[PDB]
Amino acid sequence: PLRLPVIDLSMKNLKPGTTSWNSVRTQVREALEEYGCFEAVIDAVSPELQKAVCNKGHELLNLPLETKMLNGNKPEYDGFTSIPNLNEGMGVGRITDLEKVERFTNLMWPEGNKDFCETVYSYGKRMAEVDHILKMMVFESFGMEKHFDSFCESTNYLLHFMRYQQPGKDGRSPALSLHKDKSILTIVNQNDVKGLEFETKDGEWILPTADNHIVLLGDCFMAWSNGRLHSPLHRVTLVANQARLSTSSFSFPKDIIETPAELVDEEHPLLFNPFEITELLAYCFTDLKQYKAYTGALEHHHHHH
Ligand SMILES: O=C(O)CCC(=O)C(=O)O
Ligand SMILES: [Fe+3]
């Protein structure tokens, strides 16, 4: 039976230069290269805070439709979205910018919701640190440390909630359609109800238990790596008659993604020209190889030798 790799991202392993850092970095690179994702033990967020954030997601999605639509009409990022009688969701954009979070909260709760603002801000900052460390490890695994600071400058962070109503039956109930994330990295907590399901390169399906966090790679990181890392296709399939809420943390570049020249060679021709993340996100709501950034070049496994 297939299971995603299980990687220990506890804070005790996340000190640079230590042997535990190096062994986790090796595992992270291998998992992101073969699966594009892995189960993760993450203790940057306490169980209490993780549960509180879950409640804030239910509190937010419980608001009236016209209130949630105050968050705007960009469902590719933070805007409210809904498939009738199936799922709904929105995000808190720029979750690491306290001024933005306060603004969002005042919009949703004009009378004030202080525990909401403090809870999601604390969660987003903690999950941004994990995201930061993971990217630092990936860059080290490619010898690309000299590009790391510039890549991380003004990273945009998103806290996103997806809720799926009770399907009313046992067995498999499709709940979110297949896609790749357009993030750099995405960190997912399933809040004790599994459903997130990944396709492997070989066309098998892996549905993790809800034991651990899930880290998965988005198209932005795939493209930065010149396709050396895999961004996995994934969907949601409920497998029990219970509602589900997921908490997700996305990182997006300041603006432009560009493949380092050092990640291009004779066997790895440049797959993607530079592109703007906001243009791409809006394009997908009107496979990155389908976007205008694709050069037409052959992937590595198609190199002619
Ligand atoms: O609800 C989930 O776990 C999946 C959500 C997801 O994949 C996404 O919003 O991109
Ligand atoms: Fe996704």
Side-chain angles (χ1 to χ4, degrees):
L2 280 279
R3 177 173 189 179
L4 294 188
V6 181
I7 301 190
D8 194 340
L9 301 181
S10 63
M11 298 320 307
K12 68 181 164 270
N13 291 343
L14 304 180
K15 316 150 307 323
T18 59
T19 79
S20 82
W21 172 284
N22 295 341
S23 51
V24 158
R25 167 187 66 211
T26 300
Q27 292 171 340
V28 162
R29 159 66 178 277
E30 283 253 275
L32 289 179
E33 197 170 316
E34 208 209 310
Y35 297 86
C37 53
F38 52 92
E39 300 182 33
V41 169
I42 302 191
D43 64 355
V45 171
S46 81
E48 295 85 355
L49 176 58
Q50 191 81 57
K51 186 184 207 179
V53 169
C54 180
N55 288 324
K56 305 312 166 184
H58 283 297
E59 192 185 0
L60 172 61
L61 293 174
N62 276 352
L63 289 178
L65 172 65
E66 65 275 1
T67 299
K68 296 179 289 199
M69 297 298 305
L70 298 172
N71 204 31
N73 286 278
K74 300 248 192 291
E76 66 265 30
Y77 183 59
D78 57 358
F80 180 79
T81 192
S82 159
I83 301 178
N85 317 109
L86 193 67
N87 62 51
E88 72 181 322
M90 53 193 303
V92 179
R94 285 187 59 45
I95 188 71
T96 55
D97 188 332
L98 178 56
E99 169 187 77
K100 294 305 190 85
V101 174
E102 289 168 347
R103 169 92 198 90
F104 174 92
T105 311
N106 292 345
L107 212 53
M108 294 302 134
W109 289 279
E111 71 281 11
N113 197 337
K114 302 71 45 194
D115 195 63
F116 180 90
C117 178
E118 301 180 339
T119 299
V120 300
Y121 182 62
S122 183
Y123 183 80
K125 302 294 306 223
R126 280 157 215 274
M127 288 299 185
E129 295 185 44
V130 177
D131 174 277
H132 186 74
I133 284 163
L134 285 175
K135 297 187 311 218
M136 192 189 297
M137 289 180 168
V138 172
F139 273 62
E140 287 174 12
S141 75
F142 283 105
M144 286 304 111
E145 291 94 329
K146 69 190 193 170
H147 302 296
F148 180 66
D149 281 352
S150 292
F151 187 80
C152 290
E153 216 168 87
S154 307
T155 296
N156 170 324
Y157 283 101
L158 164 74
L159 177 62
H160 203 265
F161 295 109
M162 276 310 290
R163 186 156 69 182
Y164 310 82
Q165 76 180 51
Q166 223 185 301
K169 57 192 172 60
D170 308 304
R172 300 176 49 90
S173 312
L176 189 71
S177 46
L178 193 74
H179 68 282
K180 297 194 180 202
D181 285 7
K182 303 309 174 226
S183 53
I184 299 158
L185 291 169
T186 309
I187 305 173
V188 177
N189 195 283
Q190 310 203 68
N191 293 306
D192 300 324
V193 183
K194 72 212 254 184
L196 187 53
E197 182 181 44
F198 293 91
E199 200 195 28
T200 73
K201 290 183 186 183
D202 268 349
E204 291 303 288
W205 299 93
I206 303 180
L207 205 152
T209 77
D211 285 0
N212 308 302
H213 291 75
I214 304 299
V215 172
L216 67 97
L217 186 134
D219 265 345
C220 281
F221 222 163
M222 185 274 305
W224 172 93
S225 86
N226 202 24
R228 286 162 198 269
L229 304 175
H230 179 66
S231 44
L233 287 155
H234 55 283
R235 60 189 186 196
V236 174
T237 304
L238 304 185
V239 288
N241 186 21
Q242 49 183 161
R244 176 175 180 276
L245 175 99
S246 59
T247 305
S248 291
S249 305
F250 301 74
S251 55
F252 300 98
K254 176 198 163 153
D255 44 37
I256 277 297
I257 285 293
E258 169 160 42
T259 301
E262 302 93 327
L263 300 187
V264 174
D265 57 32
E266 167 63 34
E267 313 60 58
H268 302 82
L270 181 64
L271 291 172
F272 303 101
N273 292 316
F275 59 96
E276 296 275 10
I277 182 51
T278 303
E279 289 180 17
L280 171 61
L281 284 170
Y283 175 78
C284 288
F285 268 70
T286 64
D287 197 26
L288 191 61
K289 291 210 295 307
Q290 205 69 249
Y291 189 60
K292 74 190 159 156
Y294 179 47
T295 70
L298 293 176
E299 288 169 88
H300 171 68
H301 63 279
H302 282 152
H303 179 258
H304 199 164
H305 59 265

